[PDB]
Design an enzyme around this catalytic site. Structure first.
Site, PDB file in Angstrom:
ATOM      1  N   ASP A 120     -27.236  99.544 -19.026  1.00  0.00           N
ATOM      2  CA  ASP A 120     -28.233  99.735 -20.122  1.00  0.00           C
ATOM      3  C   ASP A 120     -28.950  98.469 -20.525  1.00  0.00           C
ATOM      4  O   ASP A 120     -29.617  98.442 -21.583  1.00  0.00           O
ATOM      5  CB  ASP A 120     -27.632 100.499 -21.380  1.00  0.00           C
ATOM      6  N   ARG A 176     -32.478  95.919 -23.944  1.00  0.00           N
ATOM      7  CA  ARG A 176     -31.383  96.897 -24.124  1.00  0.00           C
ATOM      8  C   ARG A 176     -32.009  98.254 -24.329  1.00  0.00           C
ATOM      9  O   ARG A 176     -32.882  98.408 -25.183  1.00  0.00           O
ATOM     10  CB  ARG A 176     -30.558  96.495 -25.381  1.00  0.00           C
ATOM     11  N   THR A 178     -24.284 103.082 -22.017  1.00  0.00           N
ATOM     12  CA  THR A 178     -23.549 103.184 -20.742  1.00  0.00           C
ATOM     13  C   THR A 178     -22.184 102.525 -20.962  1.00  0.00           C
ATOM     14  O   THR A 178     -21.984 101.691 -21.867  1.00  0.00           O
ATOM     15  CB  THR A 178     -24.343 102.464 -19.612  1.00  0.00           C
TER      16      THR A 178
HETATM   17  C1  LIG Z   1     -29.000 100.098 -28.599  1.00  0.00           C
HETATM   18  C2  LIG Z   1     -28.929  99.236 -29.850  1.00  0.00           C
HETATM   19  C3  LIG Z   1     -27.881  98.338 -29.941  1.00  0.00           C
HETATM   20  N1  LIG Z   1     -27.837  97.524 -31.042  1.00  0.00           N
HETATM   21  C4  LIG Z   1     -26.691  96.640 -31.301  1.00  0.00           C
HETATM   22  C5  LIG Z   1     -25.625  97.424 -32.109  1.00  0.00           C
HETATM   23  C6  LIG Z   1     -24.323  96.961 -31.461  1.00  0.00           C
HETATM   24  O1  LIG Z   1     -23.909  95.815 -32.282  1.00  0.00           O
HETATM   25  P1  LIG Z   1     -22.328  95.368 -32.224  1.00  0.00           P
HETATM   26  O2  LIG Z   1     -22.501  94.499 -30.941  1.00  0.00           O
HETATM   27  O3  LIG Z   1     -22.082  94.450 -33.386  1.00  0.00           O
HETATM   28  O4  LIG Z   1     -21.293  96.342 -31.722  1.00  0.00           O
HETATM   29  C7  LIG Z   1     -24.672  96.427 -30.074  1.00  0.00           C
HETATM   30  C8  LIG Z   1     -24.318  97.383 -28.977  1.00  0.00           C
HETATM   31  O5  LIG Z   1     -24.855  96.898 -27.709  1.00  0.00           O
HETATM   32  P2  LIG Z   1     -24.083  97.071 -26.371  1.00  0.00           P
HETATM   33  O6  LIG Z   1     -23.787  98.558 -26.206  1.00  0.00           O
HETATM   34  O7  LIG Z   1     -25.004  96.482 -25.324  1.00  0.00           O
HETATM   35  O8  LIG Z   1     -22.757  96.309 -26.613  1.00  0.00           O
HETATM   36  O9  LIG Z   1     -26.076  96.238 -30.103  1.00  0.00           O
HETATM   37  C9  LIG Z   1     -28.793  97.611 -32.031  1.00  0.00           C
HETATM   38  O10 LIG Z   1     -28.703  96.817 -33.036  1.00  0.00           O
HETATM   39  N2  LIG Z   1     -29.856  98.424 -31.947  1.00  0.00           N
HETATM   40  C10 LIG Z   1     -29.978  99.263 -30.893  1.00  0.00           C
HETATM   41  O11 LIG Z   1     -30.962 100.027 -30.921  1.00  0.00           O
HETATM   42 CA   LIG Z   2     -23.002  99.483 -23.330  1.00  0.00          CA
END
Ligand SMILES: Cc1cn([C@H]2C[C@H](OP(=O)(O)O)[C@@H](COP(=O)(O)O)O2)c(=O)[nH]c1=O
Ligand SMILES: [Ca+2]
Length: 129
Positions: free
Chosen positions: A15, A29, A35
């Site tokens: 992703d 992202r 994913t």
């Molecule tokens: C997809 C997405 C992820 N994120 C942030 C939330 C999650 O924060 P936390 O990292 O504090 O868990 C993290 C998840 O990304 P990943 O799934 O790449 O780890 O990215 C957003 O802020 N906005 C979004 O639209």
């Molecule tokens: Ca992920």
């Protein structure tokens, strides 16, 4: 929403992809999906699916939503298209991602993706098997 040009630099995992956008490298992202991490079940499969889709396309395009364009880590938040086909949707349709991180204000394609996820779950694909 509108599609904007980007050129692929590297597919990173299921992703996230690195791409040149407006002439600077950006890690994107994918909006509305999650994913597995590469170290988890279906992780390598999600990674390979996004890598094949992105690398085989004649063009990649990114489409920001109405809300946040970057997350707290500096990653672009977008829908990515490989020759007109959305990668975010394709992943969900194949049971290689779950609809996730759906934030009010940044959820234009939520229903499209939920429709996809229902169909993947029906066919019991990958994550749903
Ligand atoms: C997809 C997405 C992820 N994120 C942030 C939330 C999650 O924060 P936390 O990292 O504090 O868990 C993290 C998840 O990304 P990943 O799934 O790449 O780890 O990215 C957003 O802020 N906005 C979004 O639209
Ligand atoms: Ca992920």
């Amino acid at each position: 929403l509108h599609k904007e040009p980007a050129t692929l630099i590297k597919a990173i995992d299921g992703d996230t992809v690195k791409a040149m956008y407006k002439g600077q490298p950006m890690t994107f992202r994918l909006l509305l999906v999650d994913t597995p991490e590469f170290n988890e079940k279906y992780g390598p499969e999600a990674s390979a699916f996004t890598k094949k889709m992105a690398e085989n396309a004649k063009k990649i395009e990114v489409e920001f939503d109405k809300g946040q364009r970057t997350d707290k880590y500096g990653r672009g938040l977008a829908y990515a298209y490989a020759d007109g086909k959305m990668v975010n949707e394709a992943l969900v349709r194949q049971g290689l991602a779950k609809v996730a991180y759906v934030y009010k204000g940044n959820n234009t394609h939520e229903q499209l993706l939920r429709k996809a996820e229902a169909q993947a779950k029906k066919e019991k694909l990958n994550i749903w098997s």
